[PDB]
Design a protein around this ligand. Structure first.
Ligand SMILES: [Cl-]
Ligand code: NA
Length: 594
């Protein structure tokens, strides 16, 4: 299943399938996730190895048992792919690396005022995969304040150096943040030419397009259909690029279908899996396993659960079948595509769903941006007027976690509208879709006007589909990088904020919080956060929203915004419901309702 655990001071021996340079272990893990054979990775930070060639080395590995020998190596980081991890699978990597130079082809150089502006330029340039920003103090005077846009084979830097006054990062195309947008155009009976970066067999042009989208050096493609009379031409998916970034020519050709990478689409990218089953076709590859199963959908499930399976063929031949079960051939190849696509077969083929990514275990702030906090929701009541009252956190397709006190005046579910995948409240019109409540589950021990057990589950009438802008937060099973978000007041006697706000706040021990609030019992089921001087806090209209902390590269929901004495006062921390202490309640209530 999903294995997010990391191994400190550890390096796996052998099983090597690919290597590259990455700025950190999380980016290496992402490459492992998307690589067709990687199950395990090991990463060397520059401090961990003298050998210049091995610093920032990312080593992608496979094993027929899913396990490898490992050695102690100070500073090395090892882990698993995130295959089988559902919505945790994403190619979005927002991190900026200060004091790091990521080398490649420096195809475009311009002046900018910040590393964030350089990143936006990279995101909105079709050829840019990664960038470096040379600050005012960069040693080469002729690069000071310049943004260098870059590409490389495979989209990984050709070298990574520790270097002062350089700040590097990746394009945010895979965060669905491009402003250029994307061409959904499919051209029938039309071929492209240019530079072929890969050649694979696909059952249709749509699989070809998704493979192009996630291939670092694909910008557009041409598919040759199974109608070709020339056998060696059939089902060929050519992944392509051009020195310019756009096709330099087009050629009319029967039984050819062309299109573009969808990596520059806004809000939502195609899912990085091919979920259709194809009747009458056989997908050739190396045999992993054969078992009898009850129908082709179970065969798909079997392939998905066997993490090395890439694709399968379910046989409908009588010699391969019993009364209600037939042979399911689990297969793989070097690149995740079949080695042969044969039609006129008695059987049905498809792919593993292991990478399909569709529960998991403000005062003094600044404006958020798209996809930063994709679990944040707005809880609103419509009577005659409509107004935002509370936040919430998406924790599954049909579940939001919030504060019980949001419902004190209106526990009736019928007047509530829940907005998700929204940054600015001004964007909501009478046309904007919203979720409706099917069930409110207020904690059994919560009492109106009292602070204990301030936690409620909301079951939506319809599931939400995940996008880069709308997806869940993982729940916990110490923290130093915690953030609170919402549209609440920006002053104690303040107003609702149009743009979702964020603020970074340190956690405070219960001991300390209890000293600040001598009139209330601060329990082990509460968590507190704030500054001695105040000035940064949640406020009215933020309640029920998230307190999230990023630990070992992973966001998790640590608190639910609950109360404070006023907002952002000196020596008066915010108090949050401590989600870890309600995990038994969350799992029981969601399993019992479901
Ligand atoms: Cl598809
Ligand atoms: Na697809």
């Amino acid at each position: 299943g999903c294995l997010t655990q990391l191994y400190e001071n550890a390096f796996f021996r052998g099983g090597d399938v690919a290597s590259m340079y990455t700025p950190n272990a999380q980016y290496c893990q992402m490459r492992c996730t998307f690589h067709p054979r990687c199950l395990l990775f090991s990463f060397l930070p520059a401090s961990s190895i003298n050998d210049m060639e091995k610093r920032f080395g990312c080593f992608l590995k496979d094993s027929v048992t899913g396990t490898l020998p490992k050695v102690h190596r100070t500073g090395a980081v090892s882990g698993h792919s995130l295959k089988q991890c559902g919505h945790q699978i994403s190619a979005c990597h927002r991190d900026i690396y200060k004091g790091v130079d990521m080398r490649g082809v420096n195809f475009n150089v311009s002046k900018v005022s910040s590393v964030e502006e350089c990143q936006k330029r990279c995101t909105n340039n079709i050829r840019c995969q990664f960038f470096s920003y040379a600050t005012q103090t960069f040693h080469k005077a002729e690069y000071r304040n310049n943004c260098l846009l870059k590409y490389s084979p495979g989209g990984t830097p050709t070298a990574i150096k520790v270097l002062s006054n350089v700040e590097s990062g990746f394009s945010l195309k895979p965060c669905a943040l491009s402003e250029i947008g994307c061409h959904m155009n499919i051209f029938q009976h039309l071929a492209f030419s240019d530079v072929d970066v890969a050649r694979v067999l696909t059952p249709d042009a749509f699989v070809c397009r998704t493979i192009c989208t996630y291939h670092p050096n694909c910008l557009f493609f041409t598919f040759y259909t199974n109608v070709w009379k020339i056998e060696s031409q059939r089902n060929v998916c050519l992944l392509k690029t051009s020195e310019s970034g756009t096709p330099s020519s087009s050629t009319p050709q029967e039984n050819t279908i062309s299109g573009y990478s969808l990596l520059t689409c806004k809000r939502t990218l195609p899912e990085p899996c091919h979920s259709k089953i194809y009747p009458g076709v056989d997908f050739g590859g190396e045999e992993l396993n054969v078992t009898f199963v009850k129908g082709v959908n179970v065969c798909q499930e079997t392939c998905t659960k066997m993490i090395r399976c890439q694709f399968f063929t379910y046989s409908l031949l009588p010699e391969d079948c019993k009364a209600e079960a037939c042979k399911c051939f689990l297969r793989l190849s070097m690149d995740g595509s079949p080695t042969r696509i044969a039609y006129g077969t008695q059987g049905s083929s498809g792919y593993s769903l292991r990478l399909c990514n569709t529960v998991c275990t403000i005062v003094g702030g600044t404006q958020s941006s798209w996809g930063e906090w994709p679990w944040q929701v707005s809880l609103q009541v419509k009577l005659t007027a409509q107004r935002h009252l509370c936040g919430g956190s998406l924790i599954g397709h049909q579940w939001v976690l919030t504060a019980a006190h949001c419902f004190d005046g209106l526990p009736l579910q019928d007047v509530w509208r829940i907005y998700s995948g929204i940054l600015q409240l001004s964007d909501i019109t009478k046309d904007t879709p919203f979720s409706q409540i099917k069930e409110i589950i207020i904690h059994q021990n919560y009492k109106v006007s009292e602070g204990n057990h301030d936690i409620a589950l909301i079951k939506l009438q319809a599931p939400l589909q995940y996008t880069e802008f709308q997806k869940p937060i993982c729940l916990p099973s110490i923290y130093t990088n915690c953030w609170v978000t919402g549209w609440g007041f920006s002053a104690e006697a303040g107003e609702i904020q149009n743009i979702l706000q964020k603020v970074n706040i340190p956690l405070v021990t219960n001991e300390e919080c209890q000293k600040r609030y001598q009139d209330y019992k601060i329990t082990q089921r509460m968590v507190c956060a704030g500054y001695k001087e105040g000035g940064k806090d949640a406020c009215k209209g933020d309640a029920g929203g998230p307190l999230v902390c990023k630990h070992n590269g992973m966001w998790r929901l640590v608190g639910i915004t609950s109360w404070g004495e006023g907002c952002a006062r000196r020596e008066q921390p915010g108090v949050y419901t401590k989600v870890a202490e309600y995990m038994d309640w969350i799992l029981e209530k969601t399993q019992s309702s479901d």
